């Protein structure tokens, strides 16, 4: 039920080890991209929507909120509530924020837009992505800010399209 | 993945949920082989054993044979373990019958289970906690219920495995 | 322990944690005489506490035990920790030994502002209320001769009355 | 601390846990004088205690140390917890300082019925007995000037005799 | 519990927060010795070392001297460890000056740290993550803030231990 | 489907079977099916002091791929792939013949903290000794097995082992 419901493959569990795992899109294997150099942890699970492409050639990133951590390699059906827009040394870096669908858990039903998310969590997600790469030489992050679920769903749709034209 | 070295005496089990794990109900998508989140558990319970299935089996409900595998320390989701059945827990729920095989690792994996031949050899506290878990872990899932009928022995368990492997080949 | 009942009883109370949320199936209890953390028993169901679990020091309920408190936190606390919290309600039960009330509390706003909008148990996410109720109904199912009947939830006013009466009971015995 | 050595010594004794089973390679020890949990050393081999590890308060071995106890439990305990247990045997050993016997104990029946049939160390699964002996044989292999000589297992009566003798030594230091 | 065997060269540190632990900011009540929850972490950060204080010291701010203790694996809250200062991270926060000692276990506890004599001997990635942690762990605490000044050597660290131990004796 | 490495034999990909400091479960990838099987449960109370895995598309003399110990700052998970480079090799003999295990660190892209690690002598001595001690002893209670440690050799011999085994695999 794209773009309202999407499958996300988890790469990094919430509150996990400072290991930045990434799926190799060619082989489907979970590679270690790098070790984290700040003493920070992902406040949500982190993964991507398969068969998406976006402008920079990588799939659409998704932060998935769950009551307990997921494992790397798991797939979870979720729906977007907003998107954190950012710029870094490489250009734009949007990251969608999503909650599990109601079939997986009814506890997120009232979460429709990013302002519905507990404010403390929005702030720590923002802070994490502003700062987790601070000690990586040659990198910087600027937070443009949050946009709503329509823009998030717009980001999903365009990136699904970009992937379709390529293949 | 072969069903086992010496079916139905020794079988391979693919682990979906580790013992004492997070309240996340993972399931292998049989079509794609991917580990999906089916739902989050709504009771404060954990699986007292590892939980998985025998590949290339077709029980009556159209799903593979479920197996509880006792191990000394937790396994991880996605692992395959060779084991042998010591009994089977027979249940009914809203969809019909729901049997769960109980198994221990084969002697090659560990000599410590060698004296466990039947479910009656398993420590009573663990048998009771397994029954209680499957009786109650879905208590807060709307429209569901569980009735525990009781345990049957390894011969009965092996019959269930054999019957279900045959069903998979024809279907 | 030389710990006090709270910074502003019964609105803010100190709770000594015995069992962490999502912890090992070990039923630890503080020996009220010596202050040592003892293993009372191992749990016999495959269950875990959905919140942290402890007691208010210097309180005396009717049964001779301190007031029990369930403390919600964003991540688990450790056994032996003390946390300042405030009651939002109380789960009333009866068991084979008589009455068994347990207060539900959240950290004070000084400790964490994220709970400031939690004023009554009805503000707590419903799935957690149901999992707490289910845990206490069932965690002792395999303990011979024990049973639990859940009467229901009562509000912050009733919880504070239970605290105050039990603080009063303790002072009289001193 | 004011924790007593046991309700029905030597049949049931209180054990203060210093190191959890399968825990971090940190060798904690209670300062018997102050009751504080100190770091004695870090493990230098990649080994973990196959049981919980602690001691009986108010006991003194022939060399002046409290009686050490290995406590078997279904899940790990935490450092600093107290558990009532009963001895099923004792692994006799010596180290670079003298005697270093370790009692092996299971929770009392009040704490768990699952150990009721464990009466002697030979009732304990052989793999655990061997992993325990192997652990103490080797965990100090990389500590220069430290070693262990394993002298063998004895039954519950010998273990209870050591508890009683050790309680007597402790009382004699107050007498 | 004394300040240490040979102050200021070897000191006892009581651990309040483990390395890589839960985002719970525990603090010992210096009056009673009880481990209280001071607050929860509001950024997604964890302490890159263990964190605690030296008993029987009186810093300028009225609290004991804080110490960051490097260990190969995490310690637990409430444990005491004999250690020695290799340097000090100088900072100021909302309450004033706030130096934190960096220490390693003494050679009796672990010989792996014997060649660590100054903070410059500590791996650079760890020095940087420590600096980054204290720069940012109060970013979402309204009315709390930190400015990180820089590192000073073991002698200056020992000067601080001695200065703060002196105040405790007269007071 | 994973290749042997970006720049063999200087940089190789390693598939992790057993994480550092993990459960005493001896996982192994089935080279035929690619599935992670439980080979056995460990019978000593020991843990791998590094992560443990193998280089895909290699064949050593014993018919198994080249085994690699991978040092990381925090544990990896079973099934992860890590780009690394050899700094030495632990040579042993057992009941089955020769048993070399290469020691590797992450490449500089993954972590700059190992850049100065060029040979096994660069590795902290305590870790080298604990690795040696682990492989000498973790199979002590496995019947019919024994280990003799011949010793460590340098990165050139390690790469020679890698290079020959890549050829042997192609051949
Ligand atoms: Na079934
Ligand atoms: Na030695
Ligand atoms: Na040592
Ligand atoms: Na601030």
3-class DSSP assignment, residue E159: helix
Distance CA F68, CA F80 (A): 13
CB D5 within 8 A of CB E71: no
Residue of chain C whose alpha carbon sits nearest to that of A107: C127
Tokens of B159: 């019959």
Distance CA C145, CA C96 (A): 8
* Chain B positions in Cβ-Cβ contact with residue C138 (cut-off 8 Å): 132, 136, 139
C35 and chain A in contact, CB less than 8 A: no
Tokens of C61: 């309920």
Location of structure tokens 């044989």: D137
Task: Report resolution in angstroms.
Answer: 2.0
Q: Compute, in angstroms, the gap from residue E137 CA to the centroid of ligand 4.
A: 9
CB D53 within 8 A of CB D26: no
Which of A13, A35, A39, A68 is the mutation pick for testing E, counting most E CBs within 10 A? A39
Q: Compute, in angstroms, the gap from residue C161 CA to the centroid of ligand 4.
A: 37
Distance CA B42, CA C129 (A): 11
B33 and chain F in contact, CB less than 8 A: no
Give the architecture (CATH level 2) of A1-167. Alpha-Beta Complex (3.90)
User: Which chains share 3+ C-beta pairs under 8 angstroms with C?
Assistant: A, B, D, E
Residue of chain E whose alpha carbon sits nearest to that of D34: E1
Tokens of D34: 């102050």
C-alpha distance across the termini of chain D, in Å? 19
Vertex E146: Cα angle to E145 and E147 (nearest 5): 135
- Min CA distance, E131 vs chain A (Å)? 10
Q: Give, to the nearest 10 degrees, the angle between helix C126-138 and helix B124-136.
A: 150
Location of structure tokens 């302490």: E47
Among C44, C50, C134, whose Cβ lies nearest the Cβ of B125? C44
Residue of chain E whose alpha carbon sits nearest to that of F124: E112
E51 and chain A in contact, CB less than 8 A: no
Tokens of D26: 């940190």
DSSP string, E72-127: SS---TT-EEEEEEEEEEEEEETTEE--EEEEEE-TTT-GGGTT--SGGGS-HHHH
Q: Give, to the nearest 10 degrees, the angle between helix E124-136 and helix A119-131.
A: 150
Taking residue E97's Cβ as centre, other Cβ atoms within 10 Å add up to 12
Q: Which residues pair with B35 in a beta bridge?
A: B28
- Judged by phi (left if over 0) then psi (alpha if -120 to 50, else beta), residue D56 lies in beta
Distance CA C114, CA B12 (A): 48
CB D103 within 8 A of CB D93: no
The technique by which this structure was obtained is X-ray
Distance CA C25, CA D77 (A): 10
Q: Tell me the residue ranges of DSSP E strands in C2-159.
A: 13-19, 26-30, 37-42, 52-55, 68-71, 82-95, 98-107, 148-154
Q: In F, residues 58-77, which contact A (CB 8 Å cutoff)? A: 72-77
Nearest CA to D133 among D153, D158, D147? D153
The set of residues, in sequence order, having a beta carbon less than 8 Å from that of C103 and lying 6+ positions away, is C56, C67, C68, C69, C70, C87, C89, C90, C159, C162, C163
CB C121 within 8 A of CB C153: yes
Query: Are chains E and A touching, using the cut-off of 8 Å on CB pairs and a minimum of 3 such pairs?
Result: yes
- Min CA distance, A48 vs chain E (Å)? 21
**Per the CB < 8 Å rule, is E44 touching A120?**
no
Distance CA D52, CA D154 (A): 20
Distance CA C87, CA C160 (A): 7
Distance CA F153, CA B157 (A): 53
Taking residue A103's Cβ as centre, other Cβ atoms within 10 Å add up to 10
CB B165 within 8 A of CB B7: yes
**Per the CB < 8 Å rule, is F79 touching B80?**
no
Task: State in words which class domain C1-174 has.
Answer: alpha beta
Vertex C76: Cα angle to E132 and D111 (nearest 5): 140
- Sign of the dihedral defined by the CA atoms of residues A149, A150, A155, A160, in that order: positive
The set of residues, in sequence order, having a beta carbon less than 8 Å from that of A46 and lying 6+ positions away, is A10, A11, A12, A14, A61, A62, A63, A64
Nearest CA to B99 among B48, B142, B134? B134
Question: Three-class SS string for D117-151?
Answer: CCCCHHHCCHHHHHHHHHHHHHCCCCCCCCCEEEE
Distance CA F115, CA A143 (A): 32
Distance CA D10, CA C37 (A): 22
The C-alpha torsion from D9 through D10 and D14 to D20, rounded to 10°, is 180
Cis peptide before F9 (omega within 30 of 0): yes
Residue of chain C whose alpha carbon sits nearest to that of D85: C39
Say which DSSP state D98 is in: E
User: Which chains share 3+ C-beta pairs under 8 angstroms with F?
Assistant: A, B, D, E
Tokens of A105: 């858990």
Q: Compute, in angstroms, the gap from residue A128 CA to the centroid of ligand 4.
A: 15
Task: State in words which class domain B1-171 has.
Answer: alpha beta
Residue spans per domain, chain D: 1-175
The set of residues, in sequence order, having a beta carbon less than 8 Å from that of F31 and lying 6+ positions away, is F64, F65
**Per the CB < 8 Å rule, is C81 touching E38?**
no
- CATH number at D1-175: 3.90.80.10
Helix boundaries (H) for chain F: 125-137, 155-170
Residue of chain C whose alpha carbon sits nearest to that of E143: C110
């Amino acid at each position: 039920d794209v773009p309202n419901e999407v499958n996300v493959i988890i790469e990094i569990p919430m509150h996990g080890e400072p290991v930045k795992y990434e799926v190799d899109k060619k082989t489907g294997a979970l590679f270690v991209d790098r070790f984290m150099t700040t003493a920070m942890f992902y406040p949500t699970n982190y993964g991507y929507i398969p068969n998406t492409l976006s402008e920079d050639g990588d799939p659409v990133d998704v932060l998935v909120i769950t009551p307990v951590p997921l494992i790397s390699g798991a797939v979870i059906s979720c729906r977007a509530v907003g998107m954190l827009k950012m710029t870094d040394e490489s250009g734009v870096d949007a990251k969608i924020l999503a909650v599990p669908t109601t079939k997986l858990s009814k506890m997120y039903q009232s979460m429709q837009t990013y302002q519905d998310i507990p404010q403390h969590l929005l702030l720590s997600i923002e802070h994490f992505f502003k700062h987790y790469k601070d000690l990586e030489e040659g990198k910087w992050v600027k937070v443009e800010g949050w946009v709503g679920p329509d823009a998030a769903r717009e980001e999903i749709t365009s990136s699904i399209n970009r992937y379709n034209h390529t293949k």
